[PDB]
């Protein structure tokens, strides 16, 4: 029994990582929004919350389907979908970089 670490808290994290990730996308094109704070928040929690890229990869797809769907119903240039790819790849690359740094190596 993790120090009171129930499966809910993790889900809560997921719930937040979900929105946080989402927020990162919305602010990806922000004019003054420091998306870094979003990416930093997601990155920090993702690492700390021992979150695997899986959810980042899977969660991304679901949300992406959300945008593509609207584009169809709203008949809007779906090209904007490239942002998610830039956000998905950039996000993963950002936290993935943190992992490499969290690895103490001799030398």
């Amino acid at each position: 029994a993790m120090a009171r670490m129930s499966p809910a808290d993790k889900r809560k994290l997921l719930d937040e990582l979900r929105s946080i990730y989402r927020t990162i996308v919305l602010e990806y094109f922000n004019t003054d929004a420091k998306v870094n704070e979003r990416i930093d928040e997601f990155v920090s929690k993702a690492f700390f919350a021992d979150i695997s890229v899986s959810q980042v990869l899977e969660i991304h797809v679901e949300l992406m389907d959300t945008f593509s769907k609207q584009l169809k119903l709203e008949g809007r240039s779906e090209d904007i979908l490239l942002d998610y790819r830039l956000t998905l790849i950039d996000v993963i690359a950002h936290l993935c970089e943190m992992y490499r740094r969290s690895i103490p190596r001799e030398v």
Partner: protein
């Protein structure tokens, strides 16, 4: 020329909008459940 003439096999798979993606989860999202 260089040699490495990148091909890939263009025009082979039928993809849609969100066309497949990370859907492969990667078999990583196992981290937890009992």
């Amino acid at each position: 020329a260089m040699a490495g003439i990148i091909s890939g096999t263009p025009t082979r798979i039928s993809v849609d909008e969100k066309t497949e993606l990370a859907r492969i989860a990667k078999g990583m999202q196992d981290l937890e459940s009992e």
